[PDB]
Protein: Splicing factor 1
Organism: Homo sapiens
Amino acid sequence: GAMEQKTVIPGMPTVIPPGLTREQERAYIVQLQIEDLTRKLRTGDLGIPPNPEDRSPSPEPIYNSEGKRLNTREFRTRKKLEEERHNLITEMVALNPDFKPPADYKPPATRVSDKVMIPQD
């Protein structure tokens, strides 16, 4: 539970092919995790049930400064998933420059500043 949680893909064994480098190993491992993560955002495969307490009436989605409203809980989960994937994307792109990220993925740009964007290594 909690909003701070690394969502893992359980049941995916990764047998590393020999002749890989430690960087390339991760890239192979992360690619599988990336697709599986994306599978998760694609179909909603979370395996994480909502709290029973949540059926109590909740406030309606907040608007952005641009006046655009969006979904709050849906988006929180889906965006979080994209961040898991992105975490791997940034890692895999660093490990392999020739890596091709998924099509729904878009690289980070300084267009976003609605929150605090602090880079991570």
Observations:
- The CA atoms of residues 61 and 73 lie 8 Å apart.
- The chain has two helices and no strands.
- The longest helix spans residues 73-95.
